[PDB]
Amino acid sequence: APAPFXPAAXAXXLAXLAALX
Secondary structure (H helix, E strand, O other): OOOOOOOOOOOHHHHHHHHHH
């Protein structure tokens, strides 16, 4: 059941947005 989901935690990459603090 996890397997779809837990991978996608890759998205935590969003922290890139720091550039704009």
